[PDB]
Design a protein around this nucleic acid. Structure first.
Lengths: 814, 183, 183
RNA sequence: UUGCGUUGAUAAAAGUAUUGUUUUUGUACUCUAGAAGCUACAAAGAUAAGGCUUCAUGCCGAAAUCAACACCGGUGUU
DNA sequence: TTTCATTTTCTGCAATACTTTTATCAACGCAA
DNA sequence: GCAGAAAATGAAA
């Protein structure tokens, strides 16, 4: 007989057991984990969906190259010049003849920039862009902007004298379709090699987008994110699988609200809320055969058939403070007005399938394919399909409603029972024994976590509850069975724990209301996280400051000088060193032009007084200034992605670490430390496995200062506990690993405390190790002499297990 | 293999081939030159016959693959005989001709096993160079952990701005077209 | 491959394996020891890391084929990890296991091209040693009018007095019988 | 606890558009047809390092899962 | 007294405009 | 929050 007190928090749990007889504190700890939140999954999904757009643009130009080769227009895609004007060529091909190469250039430029296709201030500017499109093409608009304002792409605010109006470069894609059709038609009048199948294939490359319910994939690709599946099944609409299940039969699909059976069930469940069998049949036939009614005519008809005034009518639904409401059919009557197909006599189940097909799909192609693939031996007519898609597009506030929580099986079991008995659906369900609503999974001793995590409120509460469930499982493993469990959505885990202890016949009362404080953390060992930052930098070779030879510096750039932040950046670089600008070393005349409004007056005031700051020339015709480059710092740790025909190194910076491998050698008696990063692993070249090869690992072992006669001690991940001990004074302290910092300095390690999340700076570690830095980060050198290092594995309850050698070779294959 | 001035010319040629700047190759952990001694080594001052065995072997091991070291040995054996080749061209051009015709024999006999990949090379600053060379290997001679027993490296010198495609079919299609562009 | 004390142990073991008397080995044209310096070398006085490159490479080139030098490099890569191996066994035994399992893969995968022959080794007096080793090679990977690229040597430790038979069927049967006799 | 109506908050997944950063090339601006590669504009290439087979409305790569080791859903150890 | 070798510190990091589906919680009413 | 050179500090040569 003990008692388990368990505190559930946002990013931690904390437990303690008490004896209930004497009253001593037997065991206490806290488990710390990151609070599970979905700003990481948003970033993952955003990047997954943007990579597909870059993929599909590249595949559009690949398909255009295959089209121009497969029709015999040009042969080698090496001699094509990249310095012709595409907009002038689009207008010239709109009226005169082009050869093959200029045609390829213009059509390639159009395929690279097609338009939007869904049709506040943005909608106004897009409507203004469409306003000039009834007699002009996009080519003429963009060429007029190019010849007049000297600037085409982006979005910019050229100043007209009357007013300042902002232009933009988005057009509807039907304009691109008309422009390409006219160009290809005049070229078809001149060139005989352009056939009409070529025209239609180009227009399908140009304006061809997948539907939003089709997803990625192909017939032979078999992804698991769209229609074609890895189980060999092709799904007509991807969202169909996503429909929930019935509330009493967990293997049947939920029923559509616009069916016949659901509307019958709803009208009959509202009528029995207020009658004989014949009166109910008469009311159903009346609302089924007459047109243009609401609640008022129906309540007058119930008053007329029962020979009673409309008062003392017991229960009906009401929307707000005003009028009442009741279920009419309202979709059967609006389906009755369809002229091409007859609906009075079809079936019961065809009405259900027709309501399913109209509820799921909104586009005409999905409705057409579902009618062809769900009504086998139905043999519909083409005009019926056109009237059906017109009817679906007509009143979509009625068909786009949702799915009624029952299924057609249960509503066929329940509909002939509430004709005779005057009772409701719940009492018939309790009478019939249809009370099976379980999610059962059987163990024999412990608690299941996938059972308890069946209801999704937030990811954070699910994370905390399953951490607490692992705590409880290991705690009742270690200290036998318990008697009382006091924990801190709440009624959900309460009901689940009561059901678990009542099913296994264990009488236990669960309720929802120092130096030896152990801790245990969650070790982080996933191996494909974000490898670096996402800005691509450019490097130059220079001599800045106290420097004697040419060295590689990383460039930085001030994007807009006029803005306040540009002035702060320019002022800091100006007061530190003036020669750090590239314009100060290639053009000093423009730089004294820059010193003049600094000395007289800041750049915003000059822009209001005279416009943009121009580059100095002998006349007033030079270009203007909006941005400036400078030499930021030297080049350190990077990933070199320099292109093939470049001449300066182009890099990615700030690359993130993954794990460390601790070695020891019996020649000098000191410990040595590897550092692996996320960018050190690789999809291997034959099969595609994600691992680190062995020759590359020996290169990192050479580089990080580890001799080859050293035994391998253990491996360390993030939040993995670590024991550092002195060997002459025998004082010890245990830490949390974080990373291997500063790759220039050998055997430097950043450590985090064992008792809190942050050091906050200043306190005293072991005498050999030193004092924590004044700013807050502890990064110390563990590759010293006279020291010893052990690994600490702690179980979920927090009992230490100190290890010295944990294997024979590092684990590189997963 | 035996060591003379031709090995110095071959080392300098492949060092200029794989590395953008010179300082990377001569500060690696195992070579470890200084600046004055590197200027003496490049100008023919120091003779590569009486240097340290470990330093010369580390310079040879960083630049070449191990099957390529076996091909250095066989090349030297075939080249110091038959002195029209010793009259005509220098040793690195003959080494390139030897390994290129070995690749042609690989592509002729067994075209189902030739796989390829991108090759990342570590410099002396701690960093690596993504896409430093193009590596080619035989799948059937595959030791465990991803090492391969038969393997060669090449450096493509094509002029167009389009990279080498991934996939087995596409990469092996690319190698057969641009044979005289890879060096 | 890289050069350390294990290469000294490997050189001394294979020199004791192939030559009847020691004096023949060092006096070869390219190694060229004296007696006192050889006695200094055998006792570990001089370290083979800062000796001449030509002398160390000639010592390694006389004993091994070039494919065997590539196998030394690959075995070193597999051997300096997995610290049971480093402590438990000296290098040359693991190298022998490496070349034997390479021979087993050669006999299993492609059994149609493995040919063999006897191997004669030259001493320092002008004479050679007839039937010094058994060399095995792959027929398909032989340079035209040149020695086989893929090639290994073995020394049989059988106790009977009967040499290796001629013919191509019988020798390849013989290798499969006396697998645990060749070292 | 079950069903039906309104309206808020949230989560998972799908289809697109225009930029941004950087490399090469061209025109302008500068210095003597050359050079320098600053400052603008326009094409073409790349856009987490990479990898696959089916040859295309082609596909995958930034989330979660967690103390290890030994013996028939349980049991044993440093 | 120049110079190499270890310990602190302090600066900087990718965005925006549309379209659509499914599910789960709440709270506000009619019923058992 | 954290990667990591820059600026500051310390122990030879």
């Amino acid at each position: 007989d003990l008692v388990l007190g368990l505190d559930i928090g946002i990013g931690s749990v904390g437990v303690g057991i008490l004896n209930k007889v004497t009253g001593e504190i037997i065991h206490k700890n806290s488990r710390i984990f990151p609070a599970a939140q979905a700003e990481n999954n948003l970033v993952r999904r955003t990047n997954r969906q943007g990579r597909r757009l870059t993929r599909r643009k590249k595949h559009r130009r690949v398909r255009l190259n295959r089209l121009f080769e497969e029709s015999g227009l040009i042969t080698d895609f090496t001699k094509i010049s990249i310095n012709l004007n595409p907009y002038q060529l689009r207008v010239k091909g709109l009226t005169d003849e082009l050869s093959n190469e200029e045609l390829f250039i213009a059509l390639k430029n159009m395929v690279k920039h097609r338009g939007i296709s869904y049709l506040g201030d943005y909608a106004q500017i897009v409507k203004e862009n469409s306003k000039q499109l009834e007699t002009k093409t996009p080519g003429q608009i963009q060429l007029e902007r190019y010849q007049t304002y000297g600037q085409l792409r982006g979005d910019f605010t050229v100043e007209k004298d009357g007013k300042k109006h902002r232009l933009i470069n988005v057009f509807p894609t039907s304009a691109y379709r008309s422009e390409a059709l006219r160009i290809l038609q005049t070229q078809q009048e001149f060139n005989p090699q352009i056939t009409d199948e070529f025209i239609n294939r180009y227009l399908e490359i140009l304006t061809g987008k997948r539907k939003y319910y089709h997803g990625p994939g192909n017939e032979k690709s078999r992804t698991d994110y769209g229609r074609y599946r890895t189980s060999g099944e092709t799904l007509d609409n991807i969202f169909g699988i996503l429909i929930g299940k019935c509330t009493f039969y967990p293997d049947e699909f939920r029923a559509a609200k616009a069916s016949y059976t659901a509307q019958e069930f709803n009208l009959l469940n509202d009528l029995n809320n207020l009658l004989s069998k014949e009166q109910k049949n008469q009311i159903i036939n009346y609302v089924k055969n007459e047109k243009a009614m609401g609640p008022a005519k129906l309540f007058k008809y119930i008053a007329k058939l029962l020979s009673c005034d409309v008062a003392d009518i017991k229960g009906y639904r009401i929307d707000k403070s005003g009028k009442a409401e009741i279920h009419t059919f309202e979709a059967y009557r609006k389906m009755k007005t369809l002229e091409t197909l007859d609906i009075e006599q079809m079936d019961r189940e065809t009405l259900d399938k027709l309501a399913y097909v109209l509820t799921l799909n909104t586009e005409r192609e999905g409705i057409q394919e579902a009618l062809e693939h769900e009504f086998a031996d139905g043999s519909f007519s083409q005009k019926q399909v056109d009237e059906l898609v017109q009817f679906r597009k007509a009143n979509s506030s009625i068909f786009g409603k949702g799915w009624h929580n029952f299924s057609v099986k249960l509503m066929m079991e329940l509909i002939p029972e509430l004709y005779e008995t005057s009772e409701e659906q719940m009492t018939i369900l309790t009478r019939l024994g249809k009370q099976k609503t379980t999610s059962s999974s059987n163990k024999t001793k412990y608690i299941d976590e996938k059972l308890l995590t069946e209801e999704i409120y937030n990811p954070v509460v699910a994370k905390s509850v399953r951490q607490a469930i692992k705590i409880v499982n290991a705690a009742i493993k270690e200290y036998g069975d318990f008697d009382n469990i006091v924990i801190e959505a709440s009624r959900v885990v309460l009901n689940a724990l009561q059901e678990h202890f009542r099913a296994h016949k264990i009488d236990t009362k669960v309720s929802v209301v120092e130096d030896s404080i152990l801790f245990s953390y969650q070790v982080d060992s996933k191996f494909n996280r974000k490898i670096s930052d996402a800005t691509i930098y450019a490097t130059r070779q220079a001599k800045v400051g106290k420097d004697k030879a040419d060295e590689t510096y990383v460039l930085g750039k001030i994007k807009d000088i006029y803005t306040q932040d540009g002035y702060d950046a320019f002022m800091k670089i100006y007061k530190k060193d003036k020669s750090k600008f590239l314009m100060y070393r290639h053009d000093p005349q423009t730089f004294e032009k820059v010193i003049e409004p600094i000395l007289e007056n800041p750049f915003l005031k000059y822009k209001e007084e005279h416009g943009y700051i121009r580059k100095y020339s002998k006349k007033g015709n030079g270009p203007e200034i909006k941005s400036l480059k400078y030499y930021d710092s030297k080049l350190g740790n990077h990933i070199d992605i320099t292109p093939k025909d470049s001449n300066n190194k182009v890099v990615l910076q700030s690359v993130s670490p993954w794990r460390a491998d601790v070695y020891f050698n019996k020649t000098t008696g000191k410990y040595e430390i590897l550092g692996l990063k996320y960018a050190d692993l690789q999809f291997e070249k034959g099969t595609g496995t994600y691992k680190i090869s062995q020759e590359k690992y020996n290169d990192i072992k050479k580089k990080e200062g580890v001799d080859s006669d050293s035994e391998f001690k253990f491996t360390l991940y993030k939040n993995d506990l670590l024991l550092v001990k002195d060997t002459e004074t025998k004082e010890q302290q245990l830490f949390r690993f974080l990373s291997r910092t500063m790759p220039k300095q050998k055997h430097y390690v950043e450590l985090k405390p064992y008792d809190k999340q942050k050091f906050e700076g200043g306190e005293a570690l072991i005498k050999v190790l030193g004092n924590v830095a004044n700013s807050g980060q502890c990064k110390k050198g563990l590759g010293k002499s006279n020291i010893s290092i052990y690994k600490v594995r702690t179980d979920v309850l927090g009992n230490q297990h100190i290890i010295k050698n944990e294997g024979d070779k590092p684990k590189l294959d997963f | 293999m035996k060591i003379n001035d031709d090995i110095k010319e071959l080392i300098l040629e492949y060092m200029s081939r794989y590395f953008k700047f010179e300082n990377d190759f001569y500060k690696l952990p195992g070579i470890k030159f200084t600046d004055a001694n590197w200027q003496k080594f490049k100008n023919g001052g120091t003779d590569i016959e009486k240097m340290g065995a470990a330093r010369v072997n580390a310079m040879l091991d960083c630049l070449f693959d191990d099957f390529e070291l076996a091909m250095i040995g066989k090349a030297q054996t075939n080249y110091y005989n038959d002195n029209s080749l010793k009259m005509n061209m220098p040793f690195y051009t003959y080494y390139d001709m030897f390994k290129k015709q070995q690749l042609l024999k690989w592509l002729k006999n067994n075209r189902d096993d030739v796989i390829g990949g991108t090759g990342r090379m570590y410099t002396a600053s701690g960093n690596y160079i993504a896409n430093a060379y193009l590596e080619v290997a035989l799948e059937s001679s595959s030791l465990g952990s991803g090492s391969y027993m038969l393997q060669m490296r090449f450096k493509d010198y094509s002029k167009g701005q389009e990279p080498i495609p991934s996939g087995r079919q596409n990469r092996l299609e690319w190698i057969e077209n641009n044979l005289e562009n890879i060096r």
